[PDB]
Design a protein around this ligand. Structure first.
Ligand SMILES: Cc1ccc(CS(N)(=O)=O)cc1F
Length: 435
């Protein structure tokens, strides 16, 4: 694996021990061969679990999620996928790592796709090696891979709303259930229904994941209600997955706006990762996978691949060259390599709108490419009437940094800034100049 110009896909089935058994072997070999190595974890939760798997090996944990005193001598770095892409974008020295290891390399967030495109391009240039660790590499067509113990797969109608009758099998279960929902809002409704039926429910989503995931260890629970974030190496002591088989797809319409289309079917990779949460204990056969729809390749035309091109266009590689997407996922977008390359000051604004602004990549790009500066929030209020953001079925209002009450009406509408109460809260704070 460790020879230059090599990219290896380590595609052992879910729970085969890629993280706890194979990764420490790779890291030991890399240290023996004096390869400057990066390990990319999808989440702070996984970074902390990797520290346990690698404990004693000289690894620099480039995250506050890990409480360790470093030697200062480590040649192996661990950081999040997003941190890798972030440091590449910023005026910060990123070592030209000899060996690039991506764990949960199926992750479809824009910064993960961008990281794969950067790494795979360095490998194609002959500059580096890489190992992509995932049961479900891009384009996989198998939603039912092998497991540590047999799984009972059942196609069944799964509720996506509160129910009064017709789903007794959901609440009649005496074990622990992980339930994949298409959105935070849909999980909120199902969670309230289960809570009303006497169930103990934990909800996970991207924004809440580190805090709330700890509750799955610290308290007794009957259901975890989660979005697709729990596809990225989140482990549960559960005996059932309920899978809507549905997700939201951000879609750019007419180059002008982003909508959250669907819900619609997940990919085969996503379905296999959702299922893969159970069947993991070779001593506990008969874990259950209840699935409520088919799979489809909904990654095609998904905004994350275009957003990944916006990130890669603004990462220095060599002179004017630009990193390509990882070949197996490169057809998911129709973009011209370099079309999103910004001049120095607009690139800095783009980065800050993502990093401090917490804006979606697409929206950060519209603002930065318009020549607007980071603190100039006039664009949050001067859009078309149809870009009016609603709160409780009336136009949302903020006090501008000038002290004027104004309707939230962004010049560019990205549905991700108001897809749930927390997102809208954060975007109101942005529009008000509060960060
Ligand atoms: C040991 C260590 C901790 C944190 C960071 C900051 S980062 N890379 O998360 O932006 C760097 C480090 F070198």
């Amino acid at each position: 694996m460790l020879k230059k110009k090599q990219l290896t896909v380590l595609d052992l089935h879910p729970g085969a021990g890629k993280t706890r058994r194979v990764l420490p072997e790779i890291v030991r070999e890399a240290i023996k061969k004096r390869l400057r190595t990066v390990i990319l974890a999808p989440t702070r939760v996984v970074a902390a679990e990797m520290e346990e798997a690698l404990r004693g090996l000289p690894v620099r944990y480039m995250t506050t999620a890990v409480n360790v005193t470093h030697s200062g001598t480590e040649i192996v770095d661990l950081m999040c996928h997003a941190t890798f892409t972030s440091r590449l974008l910023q005026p910060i020295r990123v070592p030209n790592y000899n060996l690039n290891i991506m764990d949960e390399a199926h992750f479809t967030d824009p910064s993960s796709i961008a990281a794969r495109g950067y790494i795979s391009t360095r490998v194609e240039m002959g500059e580096a090696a890489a190992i992509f660790m995932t049961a479900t590499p891009p384009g996989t067509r198998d939603a039912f891979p092998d497991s540590n113990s047999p799984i009972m797969d059942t196609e069944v109608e799964v509720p996506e709303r509160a129910w009064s009758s017709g789903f007794d099998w959901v609440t009649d279960h005496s074990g622990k259930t992980v339930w994949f929902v298409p959105s935070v809002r849909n999980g909120n409704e199902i969670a309230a229904c289960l809570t009303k039926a006497g169930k103990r429910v934990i909800q996970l989503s991207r924004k809440t994941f580190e805090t709330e995931f700890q509750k799955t260890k610290n308290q007794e629970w009957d259901f975890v209600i989660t979005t697709d974030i729990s596809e990225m190496g989140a482990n549960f002591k559960a005996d059932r997955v309920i899978d809507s088989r549905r997700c939201l797809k951000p879609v750019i319409l007419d180059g002008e706006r982003v909508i959250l289309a669907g819900p619609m079917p997940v990919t085969h990779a996503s379905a296999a990762q959702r299922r893969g949460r159970i069947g993991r204990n070779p001593n506990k056969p008969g874990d259950e996978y209840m699935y409520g729809g088919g799979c489809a390749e909904t990654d095609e035309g998904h905004a994350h691949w275009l957003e990944a091109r916006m990130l890669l266009d603004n990462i220095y590689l060599q002179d004017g060259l630009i990193a390509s997407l990882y070949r197996p996922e490169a057809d998911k977008v129709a973009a011209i390599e370099g079309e999103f390359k910004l001049r120095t000051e607009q690139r800095k604004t783009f980065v800050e709108l993502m990093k401090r602004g917490d804006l979606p990549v697409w929206l950060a790009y519209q603002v930065a490419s318009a020549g607007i500066t980071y603190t100039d929030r006039r664009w949050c209020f001067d859009g078309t009437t149809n870009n009016t953001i609603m709160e409780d079925s009336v136009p949302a209002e903020v006090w501008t940094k000038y002290g004027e009450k104004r309707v939230l009406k962004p010049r560019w509408m990205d549905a991700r800034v108001c897809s749930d109460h927390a997102a809208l809260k954060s975007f109101k704070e942005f529009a008000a100049g509060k960060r």
